[PDB]
Design a protein around this ligand. Sequence first.
Ligand SMILES: Nc1ncnc2c1ncn2[C@@H]1O[C@H](COP(=O)(O)OP(=O)(O)OP(=O)(O)O)[C@@H](O)[C@H]1O
Ligand SMILES: Nc1ncnc2c1ncn2[C@@H]1O[C@H](COP(=O)(O)OP(=O)(O)O)[C@@H](O)[C@H]1O
Ligand SMILES: [Mg+2]
Ligand SMILES: [Mg+2]
Lengths: 151, 168, 172, 370, 362, 387
Amino acid sequence: TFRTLDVDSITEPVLTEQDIFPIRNETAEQVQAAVSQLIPQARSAIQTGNALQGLKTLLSYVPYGNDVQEVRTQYLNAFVDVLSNIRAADIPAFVKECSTEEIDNIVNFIYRGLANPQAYNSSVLLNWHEKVVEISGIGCIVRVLNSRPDL
Amino acid sequence: MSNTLRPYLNAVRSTLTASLALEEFSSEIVERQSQPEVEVGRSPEILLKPLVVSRNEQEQCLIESSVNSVRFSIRIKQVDEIERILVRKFMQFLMGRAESFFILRRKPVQGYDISFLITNYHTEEMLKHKLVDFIIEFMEEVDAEISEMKLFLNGRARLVAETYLSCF
Amino acid sequence: PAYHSSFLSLTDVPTTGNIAMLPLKTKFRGPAYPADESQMDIIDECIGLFRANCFFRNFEIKGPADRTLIYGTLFISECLGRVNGLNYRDAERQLNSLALENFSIPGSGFPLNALYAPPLSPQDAEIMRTYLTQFRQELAYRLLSHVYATEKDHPSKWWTCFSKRRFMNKAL
Amino acid sequence: TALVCDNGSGLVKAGFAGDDAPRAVFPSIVGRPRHQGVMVGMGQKDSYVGDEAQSKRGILTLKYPIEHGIITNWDDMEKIWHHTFYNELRVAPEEHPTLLTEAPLNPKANREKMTQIMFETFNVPAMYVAIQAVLSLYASGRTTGIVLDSGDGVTHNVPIYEGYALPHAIMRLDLAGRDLTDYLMKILTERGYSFVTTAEREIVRDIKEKLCYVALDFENEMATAASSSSLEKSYELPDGQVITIGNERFRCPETLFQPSFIGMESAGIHETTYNSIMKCDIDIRKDLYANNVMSGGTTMYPGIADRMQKEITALAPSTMKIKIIAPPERKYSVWIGGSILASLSTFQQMWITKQEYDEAGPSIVHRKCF
Amino acid sequence: ATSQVLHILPKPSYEHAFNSQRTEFVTTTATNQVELYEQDGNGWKHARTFSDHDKIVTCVDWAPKSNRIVTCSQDRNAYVYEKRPDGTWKQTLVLLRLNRAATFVRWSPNEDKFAVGSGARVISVCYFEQENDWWVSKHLKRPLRSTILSLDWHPNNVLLAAGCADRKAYVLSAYVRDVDAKPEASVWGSRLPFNTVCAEYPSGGWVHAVGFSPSGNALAYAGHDSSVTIAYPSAPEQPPRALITVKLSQLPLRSLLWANESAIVAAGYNYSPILLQGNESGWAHTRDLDAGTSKTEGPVSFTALRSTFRNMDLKGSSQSISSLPTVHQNMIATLRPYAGTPGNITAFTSSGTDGRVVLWTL
Amino acid sequence: MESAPIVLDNGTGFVKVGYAKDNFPRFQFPSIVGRPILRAEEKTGNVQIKDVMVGDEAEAVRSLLQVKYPMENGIIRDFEEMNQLWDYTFFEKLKIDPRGRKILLTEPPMNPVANREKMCETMFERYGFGGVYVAIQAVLSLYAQGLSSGVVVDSGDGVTHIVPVYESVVLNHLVGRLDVAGRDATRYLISLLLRKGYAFNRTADFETVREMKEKLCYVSYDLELDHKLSEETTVLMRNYTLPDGRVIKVGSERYECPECLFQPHLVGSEQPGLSEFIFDTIQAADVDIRKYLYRAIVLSGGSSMYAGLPSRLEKEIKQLWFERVLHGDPARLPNFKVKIEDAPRRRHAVFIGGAVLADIMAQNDHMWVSKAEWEEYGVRALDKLGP
Ligand SMILES: Nc1ncnc2c1ncn2[C@@H]1O[C@H](COP(=O)(O)OP(=O)(O)OP(=O)(O)O)[C@@H](O)[C@H]1O
Ligand SMILES: Nc1ncnc2c1ncn2[C@@H]1O[C@H](COP(=O)(O)OP(=O)(O)O)[C@@H](O)[C@H]1O
Ligand SMILES: [Mg+2]
Ligand SMILES: [Mg+2]
């Protein structure tokens, strides 16, 4: 019977996410190289005990795209490993000196971490969430709700 | 209860309260109608990105959000088979009353134990800070409610044992 | 449904407001035209229908004959309120006193002032009162022949039970 | 909404749940003519009720269908309930639930006939019978206290702690405002004035309601009145002749503190209140002493709260604060608290319903109204 | 900044408009009705309803000089209301030709036309023809891709700004011949025919609010990402001099109003008017106009006795639920001039989902 | 007022009345007649009830009346009550003397001939109209559009009927009745609310559920989506307060009630619903005119006013052409153009088009059936009024 045939999907094509969010102006191998330069700096900053500078350097660029899940998950592995190695007393002094765009990137990537607890320690991500929202306010979560879907 | 749950329920509270910036919005696909857009998904520009808050692999929130509606869904602690039965049936009595708890769904979304739909109309006609207080007070107490139900089940298993075994 | 007046089948009947001044068998003084003593009239009908009609809770009025049957039906409910515990003689004097005492006509505390018309002139009011006083005196006298049919010093319980059966939830 | 009908011994107090005060308040009286009805017509009736009986009283024998909180005449009590619904509130009782009230330690049959007449005569959709002192505690904004309620026919003490009543500690005393009116007739006779008829009993009730008061120390007041004109003052009868009284103004109410004035062998209202607190468990007594709640018209005397506090302070140990709560609206606190209760949402599940009465008979009240 | 609560409406109030003399106001309740309120000493009284719409009224606007009310609804219609000599209002249906709901409406500065935003991917620019006695509608449609959430008119009668759910703020020519005289040359353009596009500015979230500067030389707009962006154009086919975004710490602004050429008031889901100040060198959130941003025994009545037992029964305890510290108890939906010359707004009004109508003095 | 021809849409649920060149009904009121009743209900001295009470006088006061409808399914069921509507319409709504006036009447396309005959007889022999014209209701709804081709579908209280028109020729062999309309949807809402334990069996309560339906019902665009919002969610739930003051809760019944237009089997009919009735009608037209009928599917009448009905109808015709013409091949579906015409005024398009047609023939005195022609030919005078 006719009632179940989807005509709308072919007679009125809906907006795509790239009609809402601008296309990435970098190729997949170009962003994969840019992150592969940063992950070794982020790992090295843990060994010198400077994990705060490990985050400040890792956070200087972020990968996005549905074509880059492998390097997005490698960047998230490094991000959660860096956040797990910062001492909990350093967080308030570091968060107040981040820009609004660095804060937006921190609260975005703690959200990607909280989505996968079998890989990532939620206990440190929730501690970071409490302190980032306490110091920078509710609007940083509002910017994550509104953020791009391929971050 | 909130010493172990405090970091988690603070992240849930903060992001549920950010997510409830709701508005009246009529459908772009149907004329003279409005629908909770998170529940239909037919126009993606007015959907906000779905956020997961999590304590544990077993204890999770999904917050789905839109111009006129939030869907909030939770996985709750079920560490043994008694708790799997007790939780499932408690959520079925609680969702069976959903007309009187106006922000409940009648069914959970798949892979979640209970679910809530807060619409534009609920933020207009109810105190929305008391809606997020009800969500977090439900999440704070449900583990103590379910553990007390397995104490009542233990206490009855003793009642029938002592009644039976004392009439030889 | 409920039972309507057979006298709704009459035509060119005298009228006041929108009561029908129907032919009446009676010995009381007043304006009502003498009925045949051999045939049922509106009071033999009104008492004969009352104890069925007082159970219905819906009634559509066909004309001025039914407006007259309704006023009678409401007055039988008043009589069965007045009559209780009396001897037949005390009941005749009490229910004549009830029939004679000053009552509201339609167009004045009347309970059905939406369904009944006011009197059509200052003189129509006097013919409406002088008809309704004669009618309700006869209606009282006739009812007592039924409620004191088998015994004479106590009203029949088979009639006193309708004393709270308030027709359509209306009373005078 | 629901009706609240505090059908007390001396006044019927009636109205709607959620109203600030009762909108029907009238004598709990049926009057019947005692003289030759000679003029034909004249708007005469077989009997009169409430304010109509009270205004015609010079030609009527007046009687209350309720005495000591018990219905003695059900035919006249139906006449009063009919007057509440159809004349005084102007409602169909078949459209409204009714909250009724009674004093504790009443006959079981009083509750049964009261539920039967409400469902079978007045055709009510639902009803409940509340204890009057439990209602008076809602009107206090309290969930613990001891309520001393005294009406026209009965005085009672009910202690409640955190919403639990202690039913073993409940006291009843069949002495209240009608016994004080009868005693005021007995002692007015000593100064020169005889009041004898059921109509003259309403004149001396009106004297009691505005001349009488409670002395803080009875023997000092009695000596002050025996030695000065200063306690004496006057009242004008319907006949325009004047009554002067002195120690009768505080001797009448003192019968609540000294029941032996009317020949009773009982503790006064102060010591009956203390005996009720002392029947309660030892940990609750402190909060009962701090929450003595006064109610009913027989608590409306000037000085009675100051006297009640003085008398209970002598009985209790000095180590704690006795507090007497006597609101200016305590004339109506049972009705006020009934209008609170009848407007609560859990109470909407506590009603006896028509269907449930029809299935069970009038015994349903004993297994639902406590 | 002083605030005064003028009235509490019984139902939500997404829009209100005062007349020119501030002596009556019109408001959309959340129903198909519109409420007209008159002064009553220092209070207000419900003078009349309008109820010509079938579904929920979304927006309403009152023309200052010509004294006409225009109303829009989810029924896809508009009605214009005009005052009769006897003091009643004449309704007039406008055929908007919209496929979906009307969402937002504004009268033009000369009041000779109005524009209606829609969920239909279009804006109905409506004008009157004396030759036909009709209101007739022109569709702006070229760049618009989603629901139009808000409109504003440039101080010159031609240019229309639009905030859209596609995360963009548009500046479009709504020039209509035999209504408009030719527009003067401007920073937005000079060759300016109907549906020419002067800007397509991006946002981080849905553009709830748009507003031209009092001189028309800049556009402010507010996004659902809790930002206000201020755009300074250069010329046609050329990028802006500055495109300054200030990101707020609070919930999003839904409404927006220039106080002067160097200051903006904005309000929304934060429940509070904020002040932003700046110029083409930079902008900053500078004040909150509501002091409530700082989070700041006797006889007892029957309604307190009864409500404390109803609270014990229905809720956890006797204790009443506290007010929010802001004057508005729910999101503040619209933000409109009340006093001062254009370019120097001295006071403004707000209405909210809590039904409060509130006056603010700067 | 004016000497113009009177136009009367004597519809099954509502009378609408006025004159040639009126842009809207001069009056509109329920086509109801009331008799006095008492019903264990409220009474007051603040009103008076006459032995016949009709239209707005009945509808404002209906708690006090036995309400009856002189019409059902587009035909007069009782001419004695229809005489009381027409007396009210002319003598105390319009406040006119009909003597020698010309009147335009309306009816649906497949009525019994006795309906038009006894209706024209009444105009000539009760009222003494000097001439009559009787128009097919759906061709008037095309005059309101200012339009000469398209398929016009009119759904009122009594009947849903369809009339294809091409280049001003009316395709009389293709016209049809779907015997489901606003009264069947209202009777179905009573049946659906009875499953929820509510009752509406009094003659006065039919107007209460009509107002409830007219306020709260909508057409589901996607049935499995509205069933999901219905069974998984409480968002469809709504409260309605009756004129009693009683409150009722309504949920799935809001989309489930008007679904009987699109699925007539829900009310026991075997006919195809709106979309399939319109498609089977257009698809029976000749190859050269099918495109012009699909490009102008004109909705009319109050039962076309449910929220989402145009959206559902357009979709469901695209979806039915995709099943029955393309056999499920997507490649040609974008090339199929359909346009539902869904004007704001369309509840009154029959009146508004009657007010146009009555002006077009006002000066052409030969176009009307005359009283002098009726009294010499009888019912054969009506043979002027088309095939
Ligand atoms: N907004 C609406 N939503 C749903 N139903 C509506 C709406 N508006 C009107 N109706 C319904 O339409 C019907 C009245 O329409 P209309 O006036 O066109 O019928 P009619 O002309 O009297 O009937 P008919 O043409 O069959 O003789 C009623 O059932 C009414 O409830
Ligand atoms: N001001 C007063 N002073 C003294 N006695 C009063 C006063 N007001 C009322 N009373 C008495 O209280 C009694 C009525 O009180 P009430 O609480 O209504 O009793 P009840 O409920 O039992 O009918 C009567 O004896 C009356 O005279
Ligand atoms: Mg008492
Ligand atoms: Mg019709």
